[PDB]
Design a protein around this ligand. Structure first.
Ligand SMILES: N[C@@H](CC(=O)O)C(=O)O
Ligand SMILES: [Mg+2]
Ligand SMILES: [Mg+2]
Ligand SMILES: [Mg+2]
Ligand SMILES: [Mg+2]
Ligand SMILES: [Mg+2]
Ligand SMILES: [Mg+2]
Ligand SMILES: [Mg+2]
Ligand SMILES: [Mg+2]
Ligand SMILES: [Mg+2]
Ligand SMILES: [Mg+2]
Ligand SMILES: [Mg+2]
Ligand SMILES: [Mg+2]
Lengths: 70, 103, 88, 66, 116
RNA sequence: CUUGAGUCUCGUAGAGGGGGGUAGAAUUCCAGGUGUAGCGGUGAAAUGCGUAGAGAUCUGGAGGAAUACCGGUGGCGAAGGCGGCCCCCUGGACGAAGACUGACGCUCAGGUGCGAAAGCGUGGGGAGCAAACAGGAUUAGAUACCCUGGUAGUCCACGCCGUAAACGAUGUCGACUUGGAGGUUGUGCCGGCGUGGCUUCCGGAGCUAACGCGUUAAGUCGACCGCCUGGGGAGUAC
């Protein structure tokens, strides 16, 4: 995430461009994910739980479109 | 005989040996009835990262069909040759007589 | 697996035609050729349990084909296991 | 979406083709997911092999902080 | 006592503390300041405000070298990442570029999860 | 006899396995430079490290172990399991057009092999992690949780062990019985229409005590095997 400040560029927006580049690279999450050891059993329990919950919200959204609240 | 694609990169200070080493390797393959299907000299290029503090290297690409035993002497020759800083021998399905996207 | 060359040398040598790739003799000779070839592989790769499981299937398949051939016609059975050098 | 390797009928993604490969890595040098670029699963694997194979020859970088 | 005019700021933002080291382009340190040594202990030490004070003291520590432009190399996940870069600008340096140099293994086994 | 089973021909995908080599990032250690008073850690602290110059930052080296991104209810394997890249050796699966053998099948007590991790033996290696252990806290107490360290071990070679919530808590093989939405990998024809293999979710009849399963059945059937007979004692004693 290398941001080179451009000419006639106000500082803050370059600081905004930097915050964007680090989040798109996901480096902060990558550091937080690597600070404690994650067992292979648990990484898989999470991955699965992520997928089944990502799946459930889609069908819940498809279904809620065929509904009225009032 | 199997097909191999060899990409070896050479120290920039010994680019003058690059024409020389090619015929020696060519003679070794052609000595053993191996064909040479392609042979491209990419010349000096900029490396993406430093390799042994080097910032440039002389890339040479050749596609051959040889008996697999012959490739071993090429791999051993690349290993002990300090001119060669990196190499890669890869099996290919068929002859590759075309032109690299680098030329 | 065996080369097509060797496969064709077996088909012709053991079948009554070059298209007779399915006769019991050709199959037993084909499995025997690959079983013998793999002996050198497992003399160096004793910890290759996954590939040895496929080998033991050739051993089992060849045994089931010989047992079939024995009870259908003994003349072809005894003539075959001597060419292949099999104990039985 | 719209996988550009089925569209161009590629047979191998050819690590030497640095012009193509640079389209499928981020600014910091990481392979872009097939979910983002819409590459087919079959070609995304060959793309990752070619990118790792080019990274080794120093045709491509591993990271941006080399 | 030497004049450089072109330095590099290294923000070391951990979860517990922030360290600011201003080095020249060659990597030789000119001065440094930390959030912990800026009058902040414990809960205070790991705040974005404690990093801002740490940045100002490091700018006040290298004032005799006359640095004019300053590269900023940020490392770590700490709360003092963003607020330390602002304070360097507030002091009066010119931020030429900002980079994240947080080390990522592509490595060793991390310590075990805390059961708090 | 050819429809079950198998063989041959062409190709495809794959972390299937075994052996060797190598790359980049990072950690740690060592030596040196700049520099100076803290660092580290926590809920907060302290232990600990630091003026004998730490931590931070840069340079060179040593070493081991794991391969970010790609990466996906994605793939491969009988299961256990398998993830950088390259080569060598090797197993299996699938698909298309035929030819060939001629039911040559299925299941399998005993037997045989394979079988996570921990553990054991012998010889190596040892970065990071970390049972035991030591200290600091917390606490009424705190043989813990938290912190700072840290040895076996984790790694390699060979041998043993033979067990796991080794789980889909669902034996193997075969046939039959409305659908929908995907993923993955072939293939034929003209993005469109078919046809195969594997796989994920929803649901119909049916089944089920219910939960639920539902063409990958826990539905309808056949073949063979394993096992159960109230709880504890006890998967214990001999
Ligand atoms: N970071 C890599 C290996 C190193 O570390 C991994 O998580 O697999
Ligand atoms: Mg910790
Ligand atoms: Mg076969
Ligand atoms: Mg038994
Ligand atoms: Mg073990
Ligand atoms: Mg041991
Ligand atoms: Mg020992
Ligand atoms: Mg501990
Ligand atoms: Mg398991
Ligand atoms: Mg399971
Ligand atoms: Mg059971
Ligand atoms: Mg269902
Ligand atoms: Mg007992």
């Amino acid at each position: 995430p290398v941001i080179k400040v451009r000419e006639n560029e106000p500082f803050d927006v370059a600081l905004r461009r930097f915050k964007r580049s680090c989040e798109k690279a996901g480096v902060l999450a990558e550091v937080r994910r690597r600070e404690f050891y994650e067992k292979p059993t648990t990484e898989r329990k999470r991955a699965k739980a992520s997928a089944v919950k990502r799946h459930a919200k889609k069908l819940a959204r498809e279904n809620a479109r065929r509904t009225r609240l009032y | 005989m199997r097909h191999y694609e060899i990409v070896f990169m050479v120290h920039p200070d010994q680019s003058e040996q690059v024409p020389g080493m090619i015929e020696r390797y060519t003679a070794a393959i052609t000595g053993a009835e191996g064909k040479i299907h392609r042979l491209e000299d990419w010349g000096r290029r900029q490396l993406a990262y430093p390799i042994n503090k080097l910032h440039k290297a002389h890339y040479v690409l050749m596609n051959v069909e040889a008996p697999q035993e012959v490739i071993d002497e090429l791999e051993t020759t690349f290993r002990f040759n300090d001119a060669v800083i990196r190499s890669m021998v890869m099996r290919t399905k068929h002859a590759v007589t075309e032109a690299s996207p680098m030329v | 697996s065996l080369s097509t060359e060797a496969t064709a040398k077996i088909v012709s040598e053991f079948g009554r035609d070059a298209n007779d790739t399915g006769s019991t003799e050709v199959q037993v000779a084909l499995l025997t050729a690959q079983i013998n070839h793999l002996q050198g592989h497992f003399a160096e790769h004793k910890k290759d349990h996954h590939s040895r499981r496929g080998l033991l299937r050739m051993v089992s398949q060849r045994r089931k084909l010989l047992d079939y051939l024995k009870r259908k016609d003994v003349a072809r059975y005894t003539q075959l296991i001597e060419r292949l050098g099999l104990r039985r | 979406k719209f996988c550009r390797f089925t569209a161009e009928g590629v047979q191998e993604i050819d690590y030497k083709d640095i012009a193509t490969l640079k389209n499928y890595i981020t600014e910091s040098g990481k392979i872009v997911p097939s979910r983002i670029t819409g590459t087919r699963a079959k070609y995304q694997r060959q793309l990752a092999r070619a990118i790792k194979r080019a990274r080794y020859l120093s045709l491509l970088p591993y990271t941006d902080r080399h | 006592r030497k004049q450089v005019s072109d330095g590099v700021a290294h923000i070391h933002a951990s979860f517990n503390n922030t360290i600011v080291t201003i080095t020249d382009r060659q990597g030789n340190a000119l001065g440094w300041a930390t959030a912990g040594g800026s009058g902040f202990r414990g809960s205070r030490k790991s705040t974005p405000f404690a990093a801002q004070v740490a940045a100002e003291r490091c700018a006040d520590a290298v004032k005799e070298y006359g640095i004019k432009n300053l590269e900023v190399m940020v490392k770590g996940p700490g709360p003092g990442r963003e607020s330390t870069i602002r304070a360097l600008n507030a002091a009066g340096f010119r931020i030429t570029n900002i980079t994240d140099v947080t080390p990522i293994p592509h490595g060793c086994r991390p310590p075990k999860k805390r059961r708090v």
